[PDB]
Design a binder for this molecule. Structure first.
Ligand SMILES: O=C(O)c1ccccc1C(=O)Nc1cccc2ccccc12
Ligand SMILES: O=C(O)c1ccccc1C(=O)Nc1cccc2ccccc12
Lengths: 377, 377
């Protein structure tokens, strides 16, 4: 039908209009400097997106979630992680960094900003509720798992670099409150002291055998905790979830004054997010960075494997009707911004993630419309 | 009543919440740098406020304006300008810069951003329509008159500095397209050539007798035109007015796609404007700049003379009922941002205007509520 296509275009075009206004402001008319661009982008990340997340999560009933949809979204990632573990351990070509990159490319799309409007336009509001559930699960669990993997990689690198042979003896790790992460952008001294028992205790402070799993688990937990409490999305998600539980349990309503105080800043969310994406597009040198073959492989993964694995998982679970179409089209979305931020922070194939986010945002309208049409027959 | 006070507080508090969030981000938690602050502020000025103006103006019917309200708002400024001309010409203590500053302090409040919500909360939506009419008149006429006065001052200064004695002979001025203003921040050479007729022609190019009024008028018109076409508010106001005329004449409706493309960026307007005001508050060194006595005089002017002159003009015109209260409370609003921008640009008592905007924004809630209560009896 043509009315459906017009409705999808009406929903989706203004986001691209904002994106291209930002792109032209930086590129054609030169209205903003790189520092002003960074200021706008930091405002977006700190305030606008987290408040949008609080607005969406705090309004969705957590007692009425769909269990089969959650199970399918979980089984996709379980399948991918099982395949990646098999490949990484039983194939000499395997590696942890490529496993993380493939998992992010194939499992974690942009769901909050453009997913909800696009899916509401395509299928209705209940699709918006399903996308909100997906957002909650990504924010609480899978982003946390990404933090765990990145911190484990950093800790392994530090331990190998510092204690090539003594890594088996160490039993205790002490991290001073100054340290906040193990990205490798800080000068991390590592003192070693011999205890009365004859073992070695380690203190990591800001300036091939591994230790037993217990001390590694303790260290990873400490560092994940330290990064988790400095994350605006953590507070937004947790406070929104707790408020939703209390409100839908006791039917409590927020006072109008607090609600308006939140809304006045939440209303800028979608527009400022699209503007920030346009700024990111304008700041980079080339629209394609990784290259022709690598970009082709990344796009193929994102737009075929994710949908295919989702199809297999959804058929195995027993999804049918329009839930299956929603799941597939959601899996065919462009790649999310949070994994791209993590790739920047830890420098793990950031160019592929950049190509994903930007180029897939550009080409998702035709690809997603093709999925819509083929599934709609 | 207490319900009315609660409603006004509900309408007004979230603006202050956004302002204080920006203030704390810059001052207490140090989230933004001065350059990032400038980027956010420039985004606000270029995009958010102009699109908010287009949204408000393009939706207000220009065939149903109130003529007595317009006449009262015009007569206030006519009275003030007559008094200032008398004082400036017939008193040795008079001056043009002080006349401009007093006119701005006593006539031109912040009407677009906080005036419309506050007045709608106090009196209803029709008050919002009246405030929209006031916004239109300020944007088209009085801001243009301020530009004329500032450019006349700049031209007089340039002519006196360059041609102390020959200013009477010159008959023709040529300004090269490179020049855009006469603020004094540019190195403006002034070539003089003798014509065959024996008169002197002048070319002002980027690097006590006045000339006849005709050449001065021509020069002022050229420069006012050059600054008028580089002003986002000019385009927003003119296009909104033309669209409103056409739409309310032929009942044409904008297509949903264009309307949403505008709205996605207009929705950030009020919140980003309050955030920018908070940033301006945080960036300055002292909340009071001009001093105790000068600040007292400026506040007294803003919050007593404007209301008093408006009362006299509204009684003379014949305003009664609630229109009179609306006019007085509108006159008691804090000082507008555009005259403050002009004072920055031309360096004409900018500190007094800064105190006006910021401190009056802080203290307008009690003062304006006092006006509300006293008029409400
Ligand atoms: O990665 C995502 O897109 C995502 C998915 C589900 C829930 C939240 C997010 C999320 O934080 N987005 C963003 C974070 C920071 C900056 C962003 C700028 C633009 C768009 C999304 C952003
Ligand atoms: O001066 C005013 O407040 C005004 C009055 C009527 C119509 C428009 C305006 C106006 O452009 N405001 C502003 C311009 C530029 C930046 C601003 C930032 C914050 C608030 C208002 C702003």
């Amino acid at each position: 039908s043509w009315h459906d296509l017009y409705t999808v275009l009406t929903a989706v075009i203004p986001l691209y209009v904002a994106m291209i206004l930002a792109y032209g402001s930086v590129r054609w008319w030169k209205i903003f400097s790189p520092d002003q661009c960074s200021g706008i982008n930091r405002f977006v990340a700190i305030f606008a997106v987290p408040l949008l997340s609080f607005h969406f999560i705090s309004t969705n009933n957590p007692y009425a979630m769909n269990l089969r949809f959650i199970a399918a979204d979980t089984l996709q990632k379980i399948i991918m992680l099982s395949l990646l573990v098999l490949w990484a351990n039983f194939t000499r070509s395997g590696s942890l960094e490529w496993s993380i990159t493939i998992f992010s490319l194939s499992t974690l799309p942009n769901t909050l900003v453009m997913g909800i409007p696009l899916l509401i336009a395509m299928y209705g509001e209940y699709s918006g509720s399903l996308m909100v559930q997906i957002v909650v699960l990504q924010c609480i669990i899978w982003y946390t798992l990404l933090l765990f993997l990145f911190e484990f990689r950093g800790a392994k690198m530090l331990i190998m670099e510092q204690f090539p042979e003594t890594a088996a003896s160490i039993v205790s790790f002490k991290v001073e409150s100054d340290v906040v992460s193990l990205d490798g952008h800080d000068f991390l001294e590592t003192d070693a002291e011999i205890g009365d028992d004859g073992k070695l205790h380690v203190t990591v402070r800001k300036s091939k055998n591994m230790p037993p799993a217990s001390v590694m688990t303790r260290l990873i937990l400490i560092m994940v905790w330290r990064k988790l409490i400095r994350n605006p999305n953590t507070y937004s998600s947790l406070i929104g979830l707790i408020w939703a539980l209390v409100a839908f349990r006791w039917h409590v309503a927020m006072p109008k004054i607090i609600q308006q105080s939140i809304s006045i800043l939440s209303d800028a969310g979608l527009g400022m997010a699209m503007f920030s994406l346009g700024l990111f597009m304008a700041l980079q040198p080339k629209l394609i960075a990784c290259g022709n073959s690598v970009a082709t492989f990344a796009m193929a993964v994102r737009f075929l494997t994710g949908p295919a694995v989702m199809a297999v998982a959804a058929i195995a679970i027993g999804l049918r009707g329009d839930l299956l179409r929603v799941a597939i089209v959601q899996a065919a979305l462009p790649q999310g911004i949070v994994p791209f931020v993590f790739a920047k922070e830890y420098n793990v194939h950031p160019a592929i993630l950049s190509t994903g986010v930007i180029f897939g945002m550009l080409i998702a309208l035709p690809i997603t419309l093709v999925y819509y049409i083929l599934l709609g027959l």
